[PDB]
């Protein structure tokens, strides 16, 4: 997994690759790692995939209830505080490594969370097995006062570094842009640089190739009238 977050002029962008693995096997080639905590607070997750979504939805649910209770739009520091305290309680056993980003009435924010509940602040961050490949690109090309177009370019370039150089990462690039005073735009499959080439041969079988013992109609309908 490669995930990054980059601050810019009037907001923040996060990105991620789309490969999920079971050891050396690719389980899903187009996985969705960008999760929504609230409309304008999104986070990307690495580590145990079930933990990153479970912890995101729990906090996201409580954030929604909190927003309704207080009649205020949710803040990133609220999501951050709730995530870290949850993760610290479980002492690292919930393997969720998150990059939390968003915009709220306070402004734009970018944090990372580690499984033990340790947090940090930054203008550019990376997490996962491809974080070193991504961070190399970020350390080479990041500057202050990036534009929206520059930040999206830098973020996806950092994910690409992970895709190509890290075996844990691959396939496509997902992006989410959160700008101040605007709707968050979720760009699913922003880049698609890994389409499989046409195969040399068709493997469609002649009908009747497979040996069959018994056939029967399965009753999926309910108990009938009359």
Partner 1 sequence: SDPSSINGGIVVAMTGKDCVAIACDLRLGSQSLGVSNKFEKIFHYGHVFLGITGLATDVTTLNEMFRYKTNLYKLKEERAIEPETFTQLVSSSLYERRFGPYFVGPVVAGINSKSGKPFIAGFDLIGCIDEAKDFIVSGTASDQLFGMCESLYEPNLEPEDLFETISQALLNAADRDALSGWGAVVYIIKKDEVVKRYLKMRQD
Partner 2 sequence: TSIMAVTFKDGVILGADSRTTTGAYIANRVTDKLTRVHDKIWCCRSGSAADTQAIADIVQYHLELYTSQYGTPSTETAASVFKELCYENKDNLTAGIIVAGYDDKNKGEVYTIPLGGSVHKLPYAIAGSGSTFIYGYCDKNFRENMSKEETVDFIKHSLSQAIKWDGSSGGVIRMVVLTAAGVERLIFYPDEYEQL
Partner 3 sequence: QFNPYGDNGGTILGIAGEDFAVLAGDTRNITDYSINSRYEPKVFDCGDNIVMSANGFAADGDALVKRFKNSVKWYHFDHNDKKLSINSAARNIQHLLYGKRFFPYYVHTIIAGLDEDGKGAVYSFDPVGSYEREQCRAGGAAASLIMPFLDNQVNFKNQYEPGTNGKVKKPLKYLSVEEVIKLVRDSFTSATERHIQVGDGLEILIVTKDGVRKEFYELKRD
In the complex, which residues of this chain contact partner 2 (CB under 8 A)? Answer: 84-85, 88, 91, 114, 116-122, 132
By CB under 8 A, residue 91 contacts partner 1: no
How far is residue 149's CA from residue 50's CA, in Å, rounded to a whole number? 32
Between 24 and 181, CB nearer to partner 1: 24
Q: Which of 31, 113, 163, 177 binds partner 3 (CB under 8 A)?
A: 163
Residue labelled with tokens 């997490």: 127
Residues binding partner 1: what is the number (CB under 8 A)? 34
- Cβ burial of 35 (10 Å; 0-12, 13-18, 19+) is buried
- Order of strands, edge to edge, in the sheet holding 3-8? 124-127, 3-8, 11-17, 173-179, 185-191
Within residues 43-102, the interface with partner 3 by CB under 8 A covers none
Per-position b or e across 141-154, b if 16+ CB within 10 A of its CB: ebeeebeeebbbeb
Contact assessment for residue 44 and residue 36, using Cβ atoms and an 8 Å cutoff: no
* CA angle (106 as vertex; 100, 110 as ends), nearest 5: 20
**Rounded to 5 degrees, what are φ and ψ at 60?**
-60, -40
Name the β-bridge partners of 34: 44
Contact assessment for residue 131 and residue 163, using Cβ atoms and an 8 Å cutoff: no
200 contact, one of partner 3, partner 1, partner 2, none, CB 5-8 Å limit per kind:
partner 3
Find the part of the chain contacting partner 1 (CB under 8 A) among 10-18, 22-30, 34-42, 62-70. Answer: 22-30
Q: The tokens of 156 are what?
A: 């996806």
50 contact, one of partner 1, partner 2, partner 3, none, CB 5-8 Å limit per kind:
partner 1
By CB under 8 A, residue 112 contacts partner 3: no
52 counts as catalytic: no
Q: Which of 71, 144, 210, 224 binds partner 1 (CB under 8 A)?
A: 210
Contact assessment for residue 131 and residue 16, using Cβ atoms and an 8 Å cutoff: no
CB atoms within 10 A of CB 187: 16
218 contact, one of partner 1, partner 3, partner 2, none, CB 5-8 Å limit per kind:
partner 1
Between 209 and 224, CB nearer to partner 1: 209
169 contact, one of partner 3, partner 2, partner 1, none, CB 5-8 Å limit per kind:
partner 3
Residues forming contacts to partner 3 in the complex (CB under 8 A) are: 19, 21, 24-26, 29, 129, 163-171, 194, 196-197, 199-201, 203, 205-212
Residues forming contacts to partner 1 in the complex (CB under 8 A) are: 20, 22, 25, 27-31, 48-51, 53-54, 93-94, 199, 202-207, 209-218, 220
- Positions marked active-site: 1
């Amino acid at each position: 997994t490669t995930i990054v977050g980059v601050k810019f002029n009037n907001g923040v962008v996060i990105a991620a690759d789309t490969r999920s693995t079971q050891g050396p096997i690719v389980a899903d080639k187009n996985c969705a790692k960008l999760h929504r905590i609230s409309p304008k607070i999104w986070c990307a997750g690495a580590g145990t995939a079930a933990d990153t979504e479970a912890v995101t939805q729990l906090i996201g649910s409580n954030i929604e209830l909190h927003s309704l209770y207080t009649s205020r739009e949710p803040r990133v520091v609220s999501a951050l505080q709730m995530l870290k305290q949850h993760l610290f309680k479980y002492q690292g056993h919930i393997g969720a490594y998150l990059i939390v980003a968003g915009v709220d009435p306070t402004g734009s924010h970018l944090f990372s969370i580690h499984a033990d509940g340790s947090t940090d602040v930054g203008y550019y961050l990376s997490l996962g097995s491809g974080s070193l490949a991504a961070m190399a690109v970020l350390e080479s090309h990041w500057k202050q006062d990036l534009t929206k177009e520059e930040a999206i370019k830098l973020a996806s370039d950092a994910i690409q570094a992970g895709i190509w150089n890290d075996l844990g990462s691959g396939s496509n690039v997902d992006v989410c842009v959160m700008e101040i005073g605007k709707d968050a735009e979720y760009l699913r499959n922003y880049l698609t640089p890994n389409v499989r080439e046409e195969k040399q041969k068709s493997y469609k079988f002649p009908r009747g190739t497979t040996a069959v013992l018994k056939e029967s109609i399965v009753n999926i309908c309910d108990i009938q009238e009359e």
